[PDB]
Amino acid sequence: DEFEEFPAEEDAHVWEDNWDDDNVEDDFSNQLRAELEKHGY
Amino acid sequence: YLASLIRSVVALHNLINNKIANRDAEKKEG
Amino acid sequence: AAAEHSQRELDTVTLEDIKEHVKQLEKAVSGKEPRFVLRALRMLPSTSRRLNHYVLYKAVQGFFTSNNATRDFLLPFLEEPMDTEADLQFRPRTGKAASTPLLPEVEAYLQLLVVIFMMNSKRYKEAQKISDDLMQKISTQNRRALDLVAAKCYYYHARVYEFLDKLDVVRSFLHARLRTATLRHDADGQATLLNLLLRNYLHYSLYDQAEKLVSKSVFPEQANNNEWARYLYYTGRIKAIQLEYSEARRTMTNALRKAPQHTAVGFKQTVHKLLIVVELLLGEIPDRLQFRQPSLKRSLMPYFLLTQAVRTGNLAKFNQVLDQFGEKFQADGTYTLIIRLRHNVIKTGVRMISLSYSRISLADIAQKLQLDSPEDAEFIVAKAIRDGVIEASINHEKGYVQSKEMIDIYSTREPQLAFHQRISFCLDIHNMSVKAMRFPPK
Amino acid sequence: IISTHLAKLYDNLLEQNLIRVIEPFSRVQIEHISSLIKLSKADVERKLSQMILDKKFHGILDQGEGVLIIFDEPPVDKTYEAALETIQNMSKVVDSLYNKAKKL
Amino acid sequence: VVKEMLELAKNYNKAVEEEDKMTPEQLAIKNVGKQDPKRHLEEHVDVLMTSNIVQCLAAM
Amino acid sequence: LPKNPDLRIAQLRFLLSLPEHRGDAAVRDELMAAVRDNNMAPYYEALCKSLDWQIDVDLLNKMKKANEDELKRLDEELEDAEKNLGESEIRDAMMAKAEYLCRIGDKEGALTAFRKTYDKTVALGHRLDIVFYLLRIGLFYMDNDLITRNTEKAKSLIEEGGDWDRRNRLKVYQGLYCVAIRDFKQAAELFLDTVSTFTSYELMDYKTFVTYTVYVSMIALERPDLREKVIKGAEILEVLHSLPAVRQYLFSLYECRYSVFFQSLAVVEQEMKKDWLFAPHYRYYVREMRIHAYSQLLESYRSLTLGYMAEAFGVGVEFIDQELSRFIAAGRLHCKIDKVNEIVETNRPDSKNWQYQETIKKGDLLLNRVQKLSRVINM
């Protein structure tokens, strides 16, 4: 029962990706280095 | 709830079997 | 020609199919069981395609052919081939059967087939008149077995006028048809008529009248799953536009669940888009599997960007998202909801804070939600505690948001309620299954 | 060889002593248990955390004030495991009926 | 009863998913031994549900 | 098996394709030496066009002429075998032609030649070798469809009949592909199965294989299986004795030394960024490892102050608060933060409550299925 009444209107990734992957932030190494530097003094 | 689910599944299977039997009998009629 | 002979063979097989369907309709009227008419209508969508001029020409030459007005009405609108060599006289009714008038259900089915062919041929005007004639002659009939084919023809008539880009000359007439179907106790016909009326209102933005109709009219429970899905989508749009966000989300999730497996791509696209918008408004970030699907990916890409902007909380990202695809959202009929999201974004952040923290300080929550001052945070948090988004209790004496302590749900009564609902559903399913049982007459 | 085996023996002895000293208590504070075992607070805390994380003596620590709570570990209610397995079986039976009913 | 019904549901799964069509009318008659399909099936469902419903109603 | 195509070449190409290392010199020299020794003219041209390098006219012409005359010799040998020698000789000649085609980097020509050889090859072992060669080509180029289809074909060939060595090699190949697809559970399973008898030295040396196995096992295996299969595993421990960094990283999680664990995790994230296979998934690996460490720490506690856990992780209170909030929002950690008192409370569901939730979910799914079936059949 094709609902023709409603019109029927790169990233070839095979792995499922959750939302957290999209979030943009400095690499973990930079974060850890900065935190250790700031807690070193 | 588990017993009710089992009963519903059994009833649905019996209904499917009866429907297929009726359809087969009708088809073999002609 | 090879292609011509292949087309002739496909036409002959389609003629055999229509003969089988007409025989099923006659057997249904004899036994007064919709099952057969339901199967005929089920096969109808498949036959709607793969039909050419000679197909319907031969169908009308064989069926009907009583010199009735139908042959002088559709035939002038559909061309006629030459003297086909394979002049197989497709006459299921022979002698006395031919003399007897065509069964109202079978004649209605043939008229529906010709109307569908006219639709596929873009003969909007001719299909207009043929549909009026068939609808008028089916209006006089009162056999119950005719009601299902009547609902199918009603839907196709509404579709033909929808392609007529008018969809208003039909409003009153479909209202009357739906009311008469309700009086007659018909289920499928009234279902399709209610769905089509809701669709017309949604097209022409008459939301208030649609809500009144849905509130007053009652949809039969024993309706088609596809019809139920369409009605659920329409009611979901009505509720979402009307600020009943939770009900809209539930209804549209149900409609998506009841969609025809993999049969209607566009309905799934629209349901997913509106559900994404409504869920974003309600404070929930939608699942990524929808956006990752193959058929819905390109359609929902702008909604994927919108969800990204909402979750990240970047109002600027939301503005640029609207700038690029704002007209697309408008053409999709969701621009107003997108603006509501633009001004309600803070709800998602408040909900995330409620999920994460339990005794967050007001100053710290204001800092996290990039609010200007803690008092604004207090106002927003109380508004959220109403909005069904949070379950906290502000303690203004020391200005910290104390989320309600979680309790063992199992030791409470809610599990009993859930089990009661599920057990009632299971018992009802068993009762329905054993109720019909289709036991043949010995 | 001596170092590794003596370290393992020390671990076993600490485990046995800690288990022995928590039997009467139900919400013993970490300082008292450390004093009873004659060990640093941090060492006893780490050993208790490792023991809990490894399905050893049942309980949960709370560093907010410091105690070693011990409970009786409700069994599991095998009835629910059986019910879930039966639900899975009936779901696959419904799938089979889906395979059937294709013939109308 | 629930554990034995889980085993019986495994057996019912095996019997139905097989659905051997080599004269199925004959198959249903060549495997009649008061077994998995329904006899040791919903019989146990009835036992469980009767006992539980009666006990709960008495408790309330 | 033959080293061709050399996956080190693909790794170097990806490393150069990385933004930071695009200008690296030593990798440049290594890749140029490999190209010159192997005489990959099509690969050289593709790499030059992709990386916008300056094509060496003399070197390019020399490589092209060498490839041309080698191909002419191979074609002459094929014609001689066809005219005079039997089917086995022609099959081996076409196999050599395909091998050299893969040598220079011609993906399409090499694939077509290998397909023809497979069509003309009857021996099951030679068909398996051809499938392995095509799988190696796919890994070198990262063609998902080619690798999937060829893995299915290799599985079918092994099922029909296959020696144990081919099964082990195919297990390692599936593990590598799974690591490249981010299905880390299957990667850990396969690599732990094959670590005892690693015989596929063409893809990667044993040290790299053990490092990958440790990484994927820790991202996938839980604590009991991790202890039983990785911590106490003789092969993995023996290999790790030569890799102090990987050994420290693996033992940090098991021994509960969280600061060293985070240092090693930062090092591992940096290493995977450069790796050609873990590069697409390095962020996910680091995030999941951090989540696993947080959950492991919280398993033994019910309410631990943010200060104590920040000290344990060698990080500030603010960073741990933000990360815990982010992970809680995603429904990964079972805890709720209390900022005013700075106490994290674990809300791990009771066995009864989790069982009730699971039964509710599964029963809802089954009831939806049953309702759909009833609607479909009842008409």
DSSP character for C357?
B
- CA-to-CA separations, C94 to A23, B29, C27, C65, C355, in angstroms, rounded: 74, 22, 17, 12, 75
Give the Cβ contact number of residue D58 at 10 Å.
12
How distant is the alpha carbon of residue C417 from its chain centre? Answer: 31
| CB contact at 8 A, C324 and C368 | no
D81 contacts F352? CB cut-off 8 A: no
Alpha carbon distance F233, F240 (integer Å): 11
Residue A23, classed as helix, strand or coil, is: coil
Rounded CA Rg of chain D? 24
Q: Are F45 and F55 in contact (CB under 8 A)?
A: yes
Neighbours of F220 (CB within 10 A): 20
| Deposited experimental method | cryo-EM
Q: Which long-range contacts (CB under 8 A, 24 or more apart) does F88-92 make?
A: F90/F120, F91/F117, F91/F120, F91/F121, F91/F126
In angstroms, the CA F282 to CA C16 distance is: 61
Give, as one character, the DSSP assignment of residue C240. H
Give dist(CA C45, CA F110) in Å, integer. 48
Are F157 and F149 a contacting pair, CB within 8 Å?
Answer: no
Give the neighbours of chain B: at least 3 Cβ pairs within 8 Å: C, D, E, F
Nearest alpha-carbon partner for C74 in C128, C35, C29: C128
Sequence-distant (≥ 6) Cβ neighbours of residue C217 within 8 angstroms: C178, C182, C194
Residues of chain B contacting D94 with CB distance shorter than 8 Å: 9, 12
- The H or E element that residue F174 is part of is helix F164-181
Using DSSP, how many helices (H) and how many strands (E) does chain F show? Answer: 19, 3
Residue F49 token pair: 């066009």
Tokens of F1: 């098996």
Q: B8 touching C, CB under 8 A?
A: yes
Tell me which residue of F43, F60, F209, F54 sits closest to F141, measured CA to CA: F43
Q: What Cα–Cα distance (Å) separates residue C87 from each residue in C114, C375, F273?
A: 21, 87, 74
Q: How far is CA C302 from CA C270, C281, C297, C329, C372, in A?
A: 13, 16, 10, 8, 30
Chain D, residues 25-84, CB within 8 A of chain E, namely 78-79, 82-83
Tokens 């022409």 found at: C204
D62: number of Cβ within 10 Å: 20
User: Residue E54: which residues within 8 A CB-CB, separation 6 or more?
Assistant: none
Q: Are E40 and E33 in contact (CB under 8 A)?
A: no
Chain F CB within 8 Å of residue A28 CB: yes
Nearest CA in chain F to C350: F329
CB-CB under 8 Å, E49 with B4: yes
Question: Do the Cβ atoms of C418 and F360 come within 8 Å?
Answer: yes
Instruction: Give the helix/strand (H/E) hosting C226.
Output: helix C225-241
Distance, in Å, from the CA atom of C72 to the CA atom of F113, rounded to the nearest integer, reads 66
| CB-based contact C100:C65 (threshold 8 Å) | no
- Does C171 contact A at CB distance below 8 Å? no
Are C341 and C277 in contact by the 8 Å Cβ rule? The answer is yes
Q: Are F178 and F213 in contact (CB under 8 A)?
A: no
d(CA F344, CA F336): 6
Domain count, chain A: 1
Q: Which amino acid is at F89?
A: E
Cβ F78 vs Cβ F94: under 8 Å: yes
F abuts B (3+ Cβ pairs < 8 Å): yes
Strand partners, C360: C401
**DSSP, res C410:** T
**Residue C307: closest CA among chain A residues belongs to which residue?**
A19
- Put simply, the answer to whether C440 touches B25 (Cβ < 8 Å) is yes
- F295 burial (CB, 10 Å; 0-12 / 13-18 / 19+) is middle
Measure the CA–CA gap between C45 and C131, rounded to whole angstroms.
17
Name every chain B residue with its beta carbon within 8 A of the beta carbon of C421: none
Taking contacts as CB-CB distances below 8 angstroms, the residues of chain F near C312 are none
Distance from C-alpha of B14 to C-alpha of B22, rounded to nearest angstrom: 12
Supply the DSSP string of F201-237, one letter for each residue. Answer: TTT--HHHHHHHHHHHHHHHS-HHHHIIIIIS-HHHH
d(CA C168, CA C201) in angstroms, rounded, equals 9
Full residue range of the structural domain in which residue A19 is found:
1-39
Strand partners, F337: C357, F344
Strand order, beta sheet including D60-61:
D27-28, D68-69, D60-61
Largest distance between two CA atoms of chain D = 77
CB F10 within 8 A of CB F105: no
Q: How far is B28 from chain C (nearest CA, A)?
A: 14
Beta bridge partners of D28: D68
Q: Closest by alpha carbon to F39, among F11, F71, F17, F14?
A: F71
Residues of C in contact with A4 (CB under 8 A): 159, 266
Q: 3-state secondary structure string, F320-367?
A: HHHHHHHHHHCCCCCEEEECCCCEEEECCCCHHHHHHHHHHHHHHHHH
Q: Token digits for E11?
A: 């057996």
Rounded to whole angstroms, the Cα distance separating F107 from F103 reads 10
* Angstroms from B21 CA to nearest CA on chain F: 13
Q: Closest residue of F to C224, CA-based?
A: F375
Interface contact D104, partner B, CB < 8 A: yes
Spell out which residues of chain D touch residue B3, defining contact as CB-CB under 8 Å: none
Cross-chain Cβ contact F367/B5 below 8 Å: yes
Q: Quickly count: other Cβ atoms within 10 Å of residue C221's Cβ.
A: 7
Q: Cα–chain-centroid distance for residue E25?
A: 20
Q: How far is CA F234 from each of CA C437, F188, F229, rounded to the nearest angstrom? A: 64, 16, 9
* A11 contacts on F by Cβ (under 8 Å): none
